Symmetry: C3
């Protein structure tokens, strides 16, 4: 029921986290100074998302 649904949703979020990591990687490749804040934010939100994912995986 709802449990199977939540597992489905978490897996979708996990797959999208991989896509996000890939697009971030691609953008870094294209920018080749000035991107320091961008890097900082990307790192922080990526770590935040990761922690939430791991917490959900353990919870489920």
């Amino acid at each position: 029921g709802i449990v199977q649904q939540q597992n489905n949703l978490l897996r979708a979020i996990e797959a999208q986290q991989h896509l996000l990591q890939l697009t971030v990687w691609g953008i870094k490749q294209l920018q080749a100074g000035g991107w320091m804040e961008w890097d900082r934010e990307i790192n922080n939100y990526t770590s935040l998302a990761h922690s939430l994912i791991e917490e959900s995986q353990n919870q489920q």
Copy 2:
């Protein structure tokens, strides 16, 4: 239980929304005409996602 799980999932989606905003911003920086439709779609889906997030936050 499932309630705590849904809160976890929403937070993960919120963190990923920030990452999406950042990658969009990065791409716009790199493209410097022809991106009018891309801009339109990005704006529409970003607003759509935002509205869904806000609705979920209020609901939870």
Copy 3:
């Protein structure tokens, strides 16, 4: 209740999947050899996410 919440979460994920597709498209436009693995991973995780979304839509 939780059911309406899960529907909200799925829709948010669906909107974010569109944004991901758009940023991927934008990056491909900017890279114009060497991106073969990137392309492979993007395709695989995009298909994975799609399958999870479709499964959730049918389930909900």
